[PDB]
Structures are given as structure tokens and as C-alpha cells.
PDB file of C-alpha atoms in Angstrom:
ATOM      1  CA  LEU A   1      31.186  58.937 144.321  1.00 12.52           C
ATOM      2  CA  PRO A   2      29.340  58.403 141.021  1.00 14.24           C
ATOM      3  CA  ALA A   3      30.850  60.881 138.594  1.00 15.03           C
ATOM      4  CA  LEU A   4      27.713  61.710 136.604  1.00 16.24           C
ATOM      5  CA  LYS A   5      25.662  63.095 139.506  1.00 15.86           C
ATOM      6  CA  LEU A   6      28.609  64.780 141.216  1.00 14.01           C
ATOM      7  CA  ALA A   7      29.529  66.554 137.980  1.00 14.97           C
ATOM      8  CA  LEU A   8      26.122  67.581 136.704  1.00 12.14           C
ATOM      9  CA  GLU A   9      24.291  68.366 139.940  1.00 16.68           C
ATOM     10  CA  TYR A  10      27.123  69.894 141.990  1.00 17.25           C
ATOM     11  CA  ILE A  11      30.343  70.739 140.126  1.00 19.26           C
ATOM     12  CA  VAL A  12      28.735  72.323 137.074  1.00 19.87           C
ATOM     13  CA  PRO A  13      26.344  74.690 138.918  1.00 21.27           C
ATOM     14  CA  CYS A  14      28.987  75.523 141.518  1.00 20.38           C
ATOM     15  CA  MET A  15      31.478  76.486 138.813  1.00 17.13           C
ATOM     16  CA  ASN A  16      29.015  78.415 136.668  1.00 19.09           C
ATOM     17  CA  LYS A  17      27.627  80.387 139.638  1.00 19.98           C
ATOM     18  CA  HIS A  18      30.806  80.899 141.687  1.00 22.05           C
ATOM     19  CA  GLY A  19      33.849  79.836 139.662  1.00 21.81           C
ATOM     20  CA  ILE A  20      34.949  77.718 142.634  1.00 23.58           C
ATOM     21  CA  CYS A  21      33.866  74.246 143.756  1.00 21.80           C
ATOM     22  CA  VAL A  22      34.981  72.215 146.778  1.00 23.17           C
ATOM     23  CA  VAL A  23      34.313  68.465 147.035  1.00 20.74           C
ATOM     24  CA  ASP A  24      35.353  67.142 150.431  1.00 19.74           C
ATOM     25  CA  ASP A  25      36.176  63.497 151.160  1.00 20.58           C
ATOM     26  CA  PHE A  26      36.695  62.836 147.462  1.00 21.61           C
ATOM     27  CA  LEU A  27      38.479  59.455 147.485  1.00 24.16           C
ATOM     28  CA  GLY A  28      38.244  58.292 151.097  1.00 22.88           C
ATOM     29  CA  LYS A  29      40.805  57.801 153.823  1.00 24.42           C
ATOM     30  CA  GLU A  30      42.516  54.669 152.480  1.00 27.24           C
ATOM     31  CA  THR A  31      43.191  56.075 149.007  1.00 28.72           C
ATOM     32  CA  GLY A  32      44.062  59.508 150.373  1.00 28.70           C
ATOM     33  CA  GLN A  33      46.683  57.984 152.668  1.00 28.28           C
ATOM     34  CA  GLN A  34      48.101  55.899 149.799  1.00 30.94           C
ATOM     35  CA  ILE A  35      48.494  59.092 147.748  1.00 31.33           C
ATOM     36  CA  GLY A  36      50.188  60.695 150.735  1.00 32.04           C
ATOM     37  CA  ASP A  37      52.683  57.829 150.890  1.00 29.80           C
ATOM     38  CA  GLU A  38      53.463  58.154 147.171  1.00 31.39           C
ATOM     39  CA  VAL A  39      53.970  61.926 147.500  1.00 29.08           C
ATOM     40  CA  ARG A  40      56.180  61.519 150.559  1.00 29.20           C
ATOM     41  CA  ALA A  41      58.252  58.991 148.619  1.00 26.12           C
ATOM     42  CA  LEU A  42      58.726  61.497 145.792  1.00 21.14           C
ATOM     43  CA  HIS A  43      59.822  64.056 148.401  1.00 24.23           C
ATOM     44  CA  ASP A  44      62.171  61.674 150.226  1.00 26.11           C
ATOM     45  CA  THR A  45      63.905  60.525 147.027  1.00 27.94           C
ATOM     46  CA  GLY A  46      64.771  64.050 145.901  1.00 26.21           C
ATOM     47  CA  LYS A  47      62.357  64.431 143.001  1.00 25.81           C
ATOM     48  CA  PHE A  48      61.133  67.951 143.837  1.00 25.67           C
ATOM     49  CA  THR A  49      62.725  71.079 142.342  1.00 26.90           C
ATOM     50  CA  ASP A  50      61.914  74.773 142.665  1.00 28.49           C
ATOM     51  CA  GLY A  51      58.534  75.761 141.276  1.00 28.55           C
ATOM     52  CA  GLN A  52      58.840  77.883 138.153  1.00 25.20           C
ATOM     53  CA  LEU A  53      56.929  80.716 136.508  1.00 24.98           C
ATOM     54  CA  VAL A  54      55.523  81.167 133.011  1.00 22.07           C
ATOM     55  CA  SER A  55      57.813  84.136 132.325  1.00 21.13           C
ATOM     56  CA  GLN A  56      61.189  84.555 134.027  1.00 22.18           C
ATOM     57  CA  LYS A  57      62.597  88.052 134.639  1.00 21.80           C
ATOM     58  CA  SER A  58      65.334  89.350 136.942  1.00 21.09           C
ATOM     59  CA  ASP A  59      63.567  87.974 140.033  1.00 19.88           C
ATOM     60  CA  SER A  60      64.321  84.766 141.889  1.00 16.19           C
ATOM     61  CA  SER A  61      61.464  82.290 141.605  1.00 18.68           C
ATOM     62  CA  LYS A  62      61.558  81.809 145.383  1.00 17.67           C
ATOM     63  CA  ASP A  63      60.452  85.412 145.971  1.00 16.76           C
ATOM     64  CA  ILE A  64      57.263  84.445 144.102  1.00 17.13           C
ATOM     65  CA  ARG A  65      56.527  80.804 144.976  1.00 16.71           C
ATOM     66  CA  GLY A  66      58.297  78.868 147.707  1.00 17.32           C
ATOM     67  CA  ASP A  67      57.210  75.345 146.766  1.00 15.35           C
ATOM     68  CA  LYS A  68      59.132  72.463 145.187  1.00 14.34           C
ATOM     69  CA  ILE A  69      57.446  70.293 142.592  1.00 17.30           C
ATOM     70  CA  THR A  70      57.587  67.388 140.200  1.00 14.23           C
ATOM     71  CA  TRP A  71      55.418  66.467 137.223  1.00 13.83           C
ATOM     72  CA  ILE A  72      53.673  63.080 137.201  1.00 12.00           C
ATOM     73  CA  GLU A  73      51.997  61.347 134.256  1.00 13.16           C
ATOM     74  CA  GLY A  74      50.313  58.734 136.465  1.00 13.53           C
ATOM     75  CA  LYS A  75      51.842  55.573 134.973  1.00 14.50           C
ATOM     76  CA  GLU A  76      55.211  55.748 136.741  1.00 12.38           C
ATOM     77  CA  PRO A  77      56.049  52.987 139.243  1.00  8.81           C
ATOM     78  CA  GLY A  78      55.187  54.097 142.758  1.00  5.17           C
ATOM     79  CA  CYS A  79      52.701  56.688 141.453  1.00  8.63           C
ATOM     80  CA  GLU A  80      49.775  54.359 140.711  1.00 12.13           C
ATOM     81  CA  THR A  81      47.415  55.904 143.266  1.00 13.75           C
ATOM     82  CA  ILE A  82      48.276  59.394 142.015  1.00 13.25           C
ATOM     83  CA  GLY A  83      47.328  57.983 138.621  1.00 11.89           C
ATOM     84  CA  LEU A  84      43.991  56.853 140.044  1.00 12.96           C
ATOM     85  CA  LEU A  85      43.448  60.370 141.399  1.00 13.70           C
ATOM     86  CA  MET A  86      44.175  61.805 137.955  1.00 14.35           C
ATOM     87  CA  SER A  87      41.793  59.341 136.293  1.00 15.24           C
ATOM     88  CA  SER A  88      39.025  60.269 138.769  1.00 12.02           C
ATOM     89  CA  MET A  89      39.619  63.971 138.107  1.00 13.59           C
ATOM     90  CA  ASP A  90      39.459  63.283 134.365  1.00 15.17           C
ATOM     91  CA  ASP A  91      36.245  61.264 134.761  1.00 13.16           C
ATOM     92  CA  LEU A  92      34.492  64.183 136.443  1.00 10.40           C
ATOM     93  CA  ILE A  93      35.698  66.610 133.782  1.00  8.93           C
ATOM     94  CA  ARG A  94      34.527  64.324 130.966  1.00  8.92           C
ATOM     95  CA  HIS A  95      31.111  64.166 132.594  1.00  8.29           C
ATOM     96  CA  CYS A  96      31.113  67.993 132.507  1.00  7.98           C
ATOM     97  CA  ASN A  97      31.641  68.132 128.727  1.00 11.69           C
ATOM     98  CA  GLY A  98      30.218  71.345 127.331  1.00 11.40           C
ATOM     99  CA  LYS A  99      28.648  72.379 130.648  1.00 11.58           C
ATOM    100  CA  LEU A 100      31.524  74.424 132.143  1.00 13.10           C
ATOM    101  CA  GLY A 101      30.996  77.890 130.723  1.00  9.02           C
ATOM    102  CA  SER A 102      31.598  77.915 126.981  1.00  9.00           C
ATOM    103  CA  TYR A 103      34.796  75.866 127.185  1.00  6.26           C
ATOM    104  CA  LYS A 104      35.513  72.700 125.214  1.00  4.47           C
ATOM    105  CA  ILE A 105      37.888  70.755 127.454  1.00  3.80           C
ATOM    106  CA  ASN A 106      39.996  68.304 125.468  1.00  4.52           C
ATOM    107  CA  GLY A 107      43.154  67.790 127.483  1.00  5.44           C
ATOM    108  CA  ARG A 108      45.177  68.752 130.499  1.00  3.91           C
ATOM    109  CA  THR A 109      48.633  69.121 131.949  1.00  2.00           C
ATOM    110  CA  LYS A 110      50.525  66.414 133.742  1.00  2.00           C
ATOM    111  CA  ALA A 111      49.938  66.461 137.486  1.00  2.00           C
ATOM    112  CA  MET A 112      52.118  68.873 139.459  1.00  2.00           C
ATOM    113  CA  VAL A 113      52.891  67.368 142.865  1.00  2.00           C
ATOM    114  CA  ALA A 114      53.845  70.359 145.005  1.00  2.00           C
ATOM    115  CA  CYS A 115      55.267  70.762 148.495  1.00  2.00           C
ATOM    116  CA  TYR A 116      55.572  73.924 150.543  1.00  2.00           C
ATOM    117  CA  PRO A 117      58.215  72.723 153.048  1.00  2.00           C
ATOM    118  CA  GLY A 118      57.011  74.769 155.975  1.00  2.00           C
ATOM    119  CA  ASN A 119      59.370  77.565 156.979  1.00  2.00           C
ATOM    120  CA  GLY A 120      56.837  80.203 155.975  1.00  2.00           C
ATOM    121  CA  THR A 121      56.906  79.312 152.278  1.00  2.00           C
ATOM    122  CA  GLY A 122      53.911  80.283 150.182  1.00  2.00           C
ATOM    123  CA  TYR A 123      52.872  81.831 146.879  1.00  2.33           C
ATOM    124  CA  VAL A 124      52.238  85.552 146.386  1.00  4.07           C
ATOM    125  CA  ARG A 125      48.920  86.688 144.896  1.00  7.10           C
ATOM    126  CA  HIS A 126      48.676  85.620 141.265  1.00  5.32           C
ATOM    127  CA  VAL A 127      46.472  84.360 138.434  1.00  8.57           C
ATOM    128  CA  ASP A 128      47.064  80.859 137.106  1.00  9.39           C
ATOM    129  CA  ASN A 129      46.474  81.781 133.438  1.00  7.51           C
ATOM    130  CA  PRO A 130      46.406  85.566 132.925  1.00  6.12           C
ATOM    131  CA  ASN A 131      47.341  85.793 129.221  1.00  4.34           C
ATOM    132  CA  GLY A 132      45.478  82.985 127.464  1.00  2.48           C
ATOM    133  CA  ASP A 133      47.786  79.968 127.650  1.00  2.31           C
ATOM    134  CA  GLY A 134      44.836  77.573 127.341  1.00  2.00           C
ATOM    135  CA  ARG A 135      44.190  76.684 130.992  1.00  2.24           C
ATOM    136  CA  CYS A 136      40.521  77.058 131.906  1.00  2.93           C
ATOM    137  CA  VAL A 137      40.058  74.901 135.040  1.00  2.00           C
ATOM    138  CA  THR A 138      42.496  74.421 137.906  1.00  3.71           C
ATOM    139  CA  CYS A 139      41.932  71.152 139.785  1.00  2.29           C
ATOM    140  CA  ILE A 140      43.732  70.560 143.099  1.00  2.00           C
ATOM    141  CA  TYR A 141      43.728  67.591 145.476  1.00  2.00           C
ATOM    142  CA  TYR A 142      44.967  68.094 149.041  1.00  2.00           C
ATOM    143  CA  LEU A 143      46.406  65.279 151.138  1.00  2.00           C
ATOM    144  CA  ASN A 144      47.483  66.737 154.519  1.00  2.00           C
ATOM    145  CA  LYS A 145      46.053  64.334 157.071  1.00  2.00           C
ATOM    146  CA  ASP A 146      46.678  66.278 160.301  1.00  2.00           C
ATOM    147  CA  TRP A 147      46.696  69.847 158.986  1.00  2.00           C
ATOM    148  CA  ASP A 148      45.566  72.522 161.443  1.00  2.00           C
ATOM    149  CA  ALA A 149      45.490  75.692 159.355  1.00  2.00           C
ATOM    150  CA  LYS A 150      45.017  77.909 162.412  1.00  3.84           C
ATOM    151  CA  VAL A 151      48.567  76.956 163.452  1.00  3.16           C
ATOM    152  CA  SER A 152      50.268  75.824 160.241  1.00  4.97           C
ATOM    153  CA  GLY A 153      48.759  78.345 157.832  1.00  4.53           C
ATOM    154  CA  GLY A 154      48.910  77.344 154.202  1.00  5.48           C
ATOM    155  CA  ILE A 155      45.409  78.532 153.348  1.00  4.55           C
ATOM    156  CA  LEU A 156      44.690  79.057 149.655  1.00  4.95           C
ATOM    157  CA  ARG A 157      42.864  82.396 149.583  1.00  6.14           C
ATOM    158  CA  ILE A 158      40.997  83.052 146.327  1.00  6.07           C
ATOM    159  CA  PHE A 159      39.615  86.509 145.542  1.00  4.60           C
ATOM    160  CA  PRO A 160      36.805  85.671 143.095  1.00  3.08           C
ATOM    161  CA  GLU A 161      35.988  88.676 140.946  1.00  2.00           C
ATOM    162  CA  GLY A 162      32.811  90.531 141.858  1.00  2.00           C
ATOM    163  CA  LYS A 163      32.114  88.725 145.143  1.00  2.00           C
ATOM    164  CA  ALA A 164      31.566  90.299 148.555  1.00  2.00           C
ATOM    165  CA  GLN A 165      33.714  87.630 150.238  1.00  2.00           C
ATOM    166  CA  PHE A 166      36.936  85.868 149.437  1.00  2.00           C
ATOM    167  CA  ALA A 167      37.126  82.073 149.543  1.00  2.00           C
ATOM    168  CA  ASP A 168      39.508  80.503 152.068  1.00  2.00           C
ATOM    169  CA  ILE A 169      40.402  76.908 151.154  1.00  2.00           C
ATOM    170  CA  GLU A 170      42.236  75.069 153.909  1.00  2.00           C
ATOM    171  CA  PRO A 171      44.447  72.356 152.329  1.00  2.00           C
ATOM    172  CA  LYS A 172      42.335  69.660 153.959  1.00  2.00           C
ATOM    173  CA  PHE A 173      43.045  65.943 153.620  1.00  2.00           C
ATOM    174  CA  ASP A 174      41.069  64.355 150.758  1.00  2.00           C
ATOM    175  CA  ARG A 175      39.687  67.694 149.537  1.00  2.00           C
ATOM    176  CA  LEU A 176      39.217  68.274 145.808  1.00  2.00           C
ATOM    177  CA  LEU A 177      39.009  71.839 144.497  1.00  2.00           C
ATOM    178  CA  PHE A 178      38.104  73.312 141.114  1.00  2.00           C
ATOM    179  CA  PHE A 179      38.287  76.948 140.054  1.00  2.00           C
ATOM    180  CA  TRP A 180      38.467  78.946 136.843  1.00  2.00           C
ATOM    181  CA  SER A 181      42.147  79.443 136.025  1.00  2.00           C
ATOM    182  CA  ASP A 182      41.777  82.887 134.413  1.00  2.00           C
ATOM    183  CA  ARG A 183      41.768  86.393 135.908  1.00  2.00           C
ATOM    184  CA  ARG A 184      38.432  85.819 137.637  1.00  2.00           C
ATOM    185  CA  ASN A 185      40.286  83.995 140.451  1.00  2.00           C
ATOM    186  CA  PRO A 186      43.456  85.690 141.698  1.00  2.00           C
ATOM    187  CA  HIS A 187      44.767  83.652 144.611  1.00  2.00           C
ATOM    188  CA  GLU A 188      47.599  83.319 147.099  1.00  2.00           C
ATOM    189  CA  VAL A 189      48.991  80.468 149.190  1.00  2.00           C
ATOM    190  CA  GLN A 190      49.427  81.959 152.648  1.00  2.00           C
ATOM    191  CA  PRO A 191      52.628  81.069 154.510  1.00  2.00           C
ATOM    192  CA  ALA A 192      52.897  77.435 155.579  1.00  2.00           C
ATOM    193  CA  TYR A 193      54.616  76.463 158.835  1.00  2.00           C
ATOM    194  CA  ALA A 194      54.472  72.687 158.263  1.00  2.00           C
ATOM    195  CA  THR A 195      55.078  70.444 155.252  1.00  2.00           C
ATOM    196  CA  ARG A 196      52.116  71.030 152.921  1.00  2.00           C
ATOM    197  CA  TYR A 197      51.297  68.871 149.892  1.00  2.00           C
ATOM    198  CA  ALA A 198      48.902  69.350 146.975  1.00  2.00           C
ATOM    199  CA  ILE A 199      48.458  67.839 143.499  1.00  2.00           C
ATOM    200  CA  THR A 200      47.268  70.048 140.631  1.00  2.00           C
ATOM    201  CA  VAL A 201      46.160  69.436 137.084  1.00  2.00           C
ATOM    202  CA  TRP A 202      45.085  72.216 134.734  1.00  2.00           C
ATOM    203  CA  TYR A 203      42.430  71.424 132.127  1.00  2.00           C
ATOM    204  CA  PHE A 204      42.726  73.003 128.680  1.00  2.00           C
ATOM    205  CA  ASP A 205      40.083  74.659 126.548  1.00  2.00           C
ATOM    206  CA  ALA A 206      40.716  73.361 123.050  1.00  2.00           C
ATOM    207  CA  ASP A 207      40.480  76.637 121.123  1.00  2.00           C
ATOM    208  CA  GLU A 208      42.482  78.744 123.578  1.00  2.00           C
ATOM    209  CA  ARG A 209      45.154  76.063 123.957  1.00  2.00           C
ATOM    210  CA  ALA A 210      45.433  75.782 120.167  1.00  2.00           C
ATOM    211  CA  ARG A 211      46.014  79.539 119.920  1.00  2.00           C
ATOM    212  CA  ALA A 212      48.610  79.431 122.719  1.00  2.00           C
ATOM    213  CA  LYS A 213      50.429  76.577 120.983  1.00  2.00           C
ATOM    214  CA  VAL A 214      50.431  78.502 117.699  1.00  2.00           C
ATOM    215  CA  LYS A 215      51.965  81.475 119.501  1.00  2.00           C
ATOM    216  CA  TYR A 216      54.646  79.251 121.043  1.00  2.00           C
ATOM    217  CA  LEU A 217      55.471  77.441 117.791  1.00  2.00           C
ATOM    218  CA  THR A 218      55.819  80.692 115.823  1.00  2.00           C
ATOM    219  CA  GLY A 219      58.045  82.328 118.447  1.00  2.00           C
TER     220      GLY A 219
ATOM    221  CA  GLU B   1      50.727  97.379 135.614  1.00  2.00           C
ATOM    222  CA  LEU B   2      52.708  94.179 136.163  1.00  2.00           C
ATOM    223  CA  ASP B   3      53.087  91.360 133.648  1.00  2.00           C
ATOM    224  CA  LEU B   4      51.050  88.716 135.459  1.00  2.00           C
ATOM    225  CA  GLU B   5      52.819  85.967 133.497  1.00  2.00           C
ATOM    226  CA  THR B   6      55.827  86.623 135.766  1.00  2.00           C
ATOM    227  CA  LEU B   7      53.698  85.333 138.666  1.00  2.00           C
ATOM    228  CA  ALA B   8      51.798  82.505 136.943  1.00  2.00           C
ATOM    229  CA  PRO B   9      52.831  78.909 137.663  1.00  2.00           C
ATOM    230  CA  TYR B  10      54.790  77.325 134.778  1.00  2.00           C
ATOM    231  CA  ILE B  11      53.357  74.628 132.526  1.00  2.00           C
ATOM    232  CA  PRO B  12      55.107  72.956 129.575  1.00  2.00           C
ATOM    233  CA  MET B  13      54.153  74.556 126.272  1.00  2.00           C
ATOM    234  CA  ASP B  14      56.163  72.080 124.157  1.00  2.00           C
ATOM    235  CA  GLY B  15      55.645  68.327 123.843  1.00  2.00           C
ATOM    236  CA  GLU B  16      52.001  67.439 123.906  1.00  2.00           C
ATOM    237  CA  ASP B  17      49.411  67.773 126.571  1.00  2.00           C
ATOM    238  CA  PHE B  18      47.460  64.809 127.872  1.00  2.00           C
ATOM    239  CA  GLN B  19      44.421  64.163 125.658  1.00  2.00           C
ATOM    240  CA  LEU B  20      41.212  63.157 127.447  1.00  2.00           C
TER     241      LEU B  20
END
């Protein structure tokens, strides 16, 4: 879909009013299935490792998040369609320049390709960026063609601050999701009983990310 | 209260980030 209109007339107002925005049928069936094949190839060839946390304490990571992940830049062989997804994500964000709150978005993370391998795995309630690490927008693409959340679970439940309802996001095939990464949107991945895939990038606010980098580089 | 960073999904702080 043309990025300019999608960004300015839907994503921007959705995000400013609600902090959450769902765009269904983002890339179409053919591209979505190609991304699925690339993700399944990453899985099959042993690329995924246990998802990690910002700060590590005495606890096992698997008591917090049960997924296995790899990071993708988009130019690797066999990841070209994931790269197209990332470019489309970036195109929307660039068309939102200066319209998403007061943020100045200048960069992002690599893509995290994540799998909850059924078996009841999930992610306890958490905030993506609680202490100012620079992340302002979480962007997730789901690619689960036959997912029936009523049986397989895996719903992303977001608890947007100040709202009278929470937001249940089924991990639907070809669904794109945006939400503010900060404390306004605590969220949990409810237990998954089938293999569940999602691809996330986090967009950085320039000033906050610069401060977080200064903190890291000074110890 | 709990340190919410112990629950937040890791991202690399080193290297660069992707520049748009």
C-alpha cells in the first residue's frame, strides 16, 4: 500500500491517539509466505538461540521469555524477503518523520526473528523500554498462516496506560503492528501451543538513544 | 518495585544501530 497515505492518515493518528496501530494484510499472501519460508529456514538450520533480557540477574531467561531468536540485517542470503519487509517498515516510519509524538526517529535495531516453539512458551508481562534505552516504537510483523489463537494461544496482550480496555493482538498472518515501546504499553505474550513466529524492529528516538549510548560508553 | 530492565527484551547497545 502507498506509504504516504498509510502513514499520515492511519498510522500517525492511531499512534498519537492510542499508542497502538494494527495494519492487516500488509504485504500480501505471496510475500508473507516467502517470509515464512525464510524464517522456517532460519529455524531449521539452527540459527535461533534463547531470547535475552536487557539486564541479567540470578534468574534464568526462560522463566521470563520462552522464545528463541536471531538478528537479521536484511542483506544476508536467504533473507531477502525479510529485508523487503524491513525496507517497507522503514519506508512507513520515514513517512512519519516528526509526526509520531515528539520523537525524532533516526535509526533502528536489526530485525529480531523470534519463535515461540509451542509447548506453552510465552513472555511474562513487561515493558520493551522501561529505562530510556532509546527505543520509541516497536514494530512487529506476524507470519503465522494457519494460526487459530482460540486453540494455540500466543496472543500479545497490551495494557495501554489509561484505557478502559486492553488490546489483544492475535499473531495473524501478514499483520503489522506498531506500539510505543515505553511504559505506556506493558504487554505479555500469552502461552503458545503451536510454533509461533514474529519479526520485530525497534525504532530509536535520536536524543534518547544518544543519551543511552553515552551511558553505555561511560560505564 | 522490580527493575523492569530485568524483563525487557535485549537489544545490542554496542556497534552501531541501523541509520534510516
